[PDB]
Amino acid sequence: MPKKRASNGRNKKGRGHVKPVRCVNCSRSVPKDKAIKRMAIRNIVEAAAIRDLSEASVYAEYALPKTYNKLHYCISCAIHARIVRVRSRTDRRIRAPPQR
């Protein structure tokens, strides 16, 4: 088995052995670098409310805030569903943030 990647675990370069983060789903300790650190900026209320809440509510405009779950995923855990998405050898060089 040669290198799949040049980076591998990524942030760790010029940096002995950093601390780790328990994943979300599996609770699988993974370094905070190998971690797949997605950001889940979700609304406090789901879209298919929202009217209903604002109808029954006091005040106008409202807080209507957004919870800020900075997730993590143990790569495996991530692949099983999440942003990972197994790319082609040539495509694996791309660091560009997807979509957008």
- Binding window for Zn ion (CB under 5 A); candidates: 4-12, 51-59, 76-84, 85-93: 76-84
26 counts as binding Zn ion under rule CB under 5 A: yes
Between vectors from CA 32 to CA 26 and to CA 38, what angle results, nearest 5°?
70
Q: Is 14 annotated as a binding residue?
A: no
The two three-digit tokens of residue 71, written as one number: 């997730």
Read out DSSP for 57-76? -SSSS----EEEEE----TH
The two three-digit tokens of residue 13, written as one number: 């370069």
> Looking at beta carbons only, is 57 or 92 nearer to RNA?
92
Which does residue 58 bind out of Zn ion, RNA, Mg ion, none, counting CB within 5 to 8 angstroms by kind? none
Q: Which residues bind Zn ion (CB under 5 A)?
A: 23, 25-26, 28, 74, 77
